[PDB]
Write an enzyme that holds these catalytic residues in place. Structure first.
Site, PDB file in Angstrom:
ATOM      1  CG  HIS A 224      -0.333  -0.544   2.454  1.00  0.00           C
ATOM      2  ND1 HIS A 224       0.769   0.019   3.056  1.00  0.00           N
ATOM      3  CD2 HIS A 224      -0.679  -1.607   3.217  1.00  0.00           C
ATOM      4  CE1 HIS A 224       1.080  -0.676   4.136  1.00  0.00           C
ATOM      5  NE2 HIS A 224       0.216  -1.666   4.257  1.00  0.00           N
TER       6      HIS A 224
ATOM      7  CG  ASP B  99      -0.945  -4.967   2.685  1.00  0.00           C
ATOM      8  OD1 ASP B  99       0.016  -4.370   2.156  1.00  0.00           O
ATOM      9  OD2 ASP B  99      -1.918  -4.352   3.167  1.00  0.00           O
TER      10      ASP B  99
ATOM     11  CB  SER C 291       3.761   0.655   7.092  1.00  0.00           C
ATOM     12  OG  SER C 291       2.563   0.779   7.835  1.00  0.00           O
TER      13      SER C 291
END
EC number: 3.4.21.90
Lengths: 159, 52, 159, 159, 159
Positions: free
Chosen positions: C36, C58, C110
């Site tokens: 993402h 992901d 992240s």
């Protein structure tokens, strides 16, 4: 300091072009030498000793005479995690792989044995591949069943 | 026949494409959990089904 | 104490219009980048690598070059209960969940590897959410068999 | 001194490929941006905002979200004669013109919220022309009924 | 040292996403930049200028405005053998070939000028290549007739 004093004279350089290109080692009653080294053993008795080819394992093995079986390296089947003695310096066994610091090991160093802190051979090297800050080794060791597992890293540069 | 043969051919092609799509999706879903491990150890799936 | 776990140059930032929005981390000879997060890794050699996507877990993974494999994090298949070290601060593992103090982790936090008390990565956090009065992290870890299980809390908030 | 009001600066640079072309203000719970500049707002929340154009007054206006409507400049309709504050020194509003010291302000120093002694914005500069004595600026200001009166000096250049 | 006396505001950098990519220099009332550098010159006045191509000699050259001609580098044709001054360090000229010490020059260093003792440019650097300690570098110079000879070493890698 602690790693270099573990000196044994059982290893014998191979002589051709009048220069050192590799080492052949007597372990457990068998003389081992790689494919890539050409020449005659410094010891004449082993130089005249016939060898049997094992190309897929990349080592000629020869049966030592019965008299010289008394003085030879002791093979090992257990490989505890951590550092091991060597001719140059400490060799780290991690994740089922033998690694050496940067720069250590080059052409003409093939065939040297990796021993343990106890003082007996645990594996023998045939080449090394530089992975960066730490250099991995193409090396063959011994198992509990004596199946002689050979560990060859990807695209390893041959010593 | 032209209508029936075309309908049968279309159904067969759609079925084959869908089966291939499901097989590829199943292979991805069964390999990626084992594939993206940093050391990439994949003995179990290749031994039980030979997906690769 | 806590400062002895931030001297890891093997992590890499992701640039987007000169801003930071995520981190790409190298573990066990493989480069993992959160999916993402949009942008480009600052390091040219790692940026040039072609990565293979993984939508379900992901994150996208790529195979690092041979010369970069030496200096790389080490993953762990065991996650004992209790304390853990992270760049932002302490993290705590309870009942299969990582939790952090309030307000820790936000936009651009992240891909951060959650180091252990030993000093090696055990998982990679992709986002965190605060439900009720407790904050949990969506994070992908590694099982003993190496199946890369992911634990994600309900209604997870990105980054 | 007039510089202790730089703490009130809540303006956001607009960057075009890493180059700042202007500044966007948040006045009275309303985001104002120069139209002639190009690029993206400093923060993502205003970057994703949708702006409505105004070509006659040469600026885009948007409505700030409810979260930050209080965190904004507060405006003023009256402009008493005299000198006010700015990031580039005292600038004098005299009989209909906001004029600065000569040689102050150039390309990229546009969209700048003007301030007075009360820390309250009364106008937003867009461009200016350098007269022999001083420099007069194209500016968007406010009046008592609030119809957004705009002044541009004859033969003015954009910033 | 001679680095402190090589200060020159005439030279300008060509950026690429906010990083040093090229170097354009104004010499003899003419702006020069290489083919292989992509980006926009930082100076707006030269960025507004329209430049013409020269593929064989690897130079975009543009005519500077009248006000710009007041301060610019001075060029000469004579190149006596010996040491010359460069921004990175000292270079030496022997056998009709410029060369630099080991590892002095990399990507983004192309387009920098070469200086002599009396303070005037004699050539413009485009790239280099290294075989020994010396590193002969591709460079464009000027003859006594004013023909702009371009010396280039064999398989010179672009800078």
């Amino acid at each position: 300091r602690m790693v270099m004093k573990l000196e044994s004279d059982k290893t014998f350089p191979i002589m051709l072009e009048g220069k050192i290109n590799g080492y052949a080692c007597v372990v457990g009653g068998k003389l081992f030498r790689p494919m890539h080294v050409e020449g005659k053993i410094d010891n004449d008795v082993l130089a005249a000793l016939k060898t049997k080819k094992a190309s897929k394992y990349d080592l000629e093995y020869a049966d030592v005479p019965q008299n010289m079986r008394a003085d030879t390296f002791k093979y090992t089947h257990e490989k505890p995690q951590g550092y091991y003695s060597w001719h140059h310096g400490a060799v780290q066994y991690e994740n089922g792989r033998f690694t050496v610091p940067k720069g250590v090991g080059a052409k003409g160093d093939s065939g040297r044995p990796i021993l343990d802190n106890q003082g007996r051979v645990v594996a023998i090297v045939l080449g090394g591949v530089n992975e960066g800050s730490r250099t991995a080794l193409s090396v063959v060791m011994w198992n509990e069943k004596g199946v002689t597992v050979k560990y060859t890293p990807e695209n390893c540069e041959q010593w | 026949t032209i209508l029936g043969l075309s309908i049968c051919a279309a159904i067969a092609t759609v079925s084959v494409a869908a089966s291939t799509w499901l097989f590829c999706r199943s292979r991805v879903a069964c390999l990626t959990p084992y594939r993206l491990t940093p050391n990439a150890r994949i003995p179990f799936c290749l031994a039980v089904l030979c997906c690769a």
